[PDB]
Design a protein around this ligand. Structure first.
Ligand SMILES: CCC(=O)NC(=S)N1CCCc2ccccc21
Length: 284
């Protein structure tokens, strides 16, 4: 069923809360035993948001390999993403270790460091060129190279050095600065404009490790970004673009990380973004 007609049918019947609960009911439940070990309590921002054991990212160290991050592999789509929480004061070094070990080119940040008067994530990147950051626990150095500030978002060029080997890589930081918490972007338009900038960068392409995507918990805004990207890619690839079922794509992605799309209003925006984006995919 053309998602645009499904959309108007749910909107006119006001049944978004009902569709959403149906997905919550059918979603996968897999064990998260490593996340719940006592030694890992301070590595989790939220008690009720954990990576599944089968899809968790492992840090390459014998001490403790745990980070709150999941590998989302989307089969038909040919795309991978790492979804993670906003780093904590004691996990900023683990975060950059993971970026290094997984060979990621991009980091996509969908939250502000402070929202609703509380800290939603650590200040994990340098704000000035001449004030670099050293992560002594993981032996990494991070330097700000350049910053391009727009109205809705900011792109930064960062240099990450492995202090052990003196190899360096360029990381691109894509920071959406205007998305409300348990809320939605105001127009599908600024969201999509941002998604197309990440794509243009090469950050989502198979020659790199998976893009790292986060918000505060790494399920809500993060889920919206990956869901919209994957649905638009499948519409590009298939003979019949109207065969893309957003609810079925969301359930496939929930096999890899719990709780993706955290409100009935976030799913609706997901639709709008895919539907408006199609206008591009189908040749405009
Ligand atoms: C376990 C892998 C798997 O079976 N994936 C399947 S069926 N689909 C079909 C529809 C939703 C979707 C979206 C992006 C990529 C793949 C898929």
């Amino acid at each position: 069923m053309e998602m645009e007609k499904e959309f108007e049918q749910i909107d006119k019947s006001g049944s978004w809360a009902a569709i959403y609960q149906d997905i919550r009911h059918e979603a996968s439940d897999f064990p998260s035993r490593v996340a719940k070990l006592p030694k890992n309590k301070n590595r989790n921002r939220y008690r009720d948001v954990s990576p599944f054991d089968h899809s968790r990212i492992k840090l390459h160290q014998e001490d403790n390999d745990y980070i709150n991050a999941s590998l989302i592999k989307m089969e038909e789509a040919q795309r991978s993403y790492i979804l993670t929480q906003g780093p904590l004061p004691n996990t900023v070094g683990h975060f950059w270790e993971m970026v290094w070990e997984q060979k990621s080119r991009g980091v996509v940040m969908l939250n502000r460091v402070m929202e609703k008067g509380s800290l939603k994530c650590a200040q994990y990147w340098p704000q000035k060129e001449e004030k670099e950051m050293i992560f002594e626990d993981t032996n990494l150095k991070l330097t700000l190279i350049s910053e391009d500030i727009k109205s809705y978002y900011t792109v930064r060029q960062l240099e990450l050095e492995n202090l052990t080997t003196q190899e360096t890589r360029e990381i691109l930081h894509f920071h959406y600065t205007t998305w409300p918490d348990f809320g939605v972007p105001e127009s599908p338009a600024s969201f999509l404009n941002f998604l197309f900038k990440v794509r243009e960068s090469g950050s989502l392409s198979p020659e790199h490790g998976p893009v790292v995507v986060h918000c505060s918990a790494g399920i809500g805004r993060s889920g919206t970004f990956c869901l919209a990207d994957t649905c638009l890619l499948l519409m590009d690839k298939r003979k019949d673009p109207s065969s893309v079922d957003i609810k079925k794509v969301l359930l496939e992605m929930r096999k890899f990380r719990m709780g993706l799309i955290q409100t009935a209003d976030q799913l609706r925006f997901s639709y709008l973004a895919v539907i408006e984006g199609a206008k591009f995919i189908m040749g405009d």
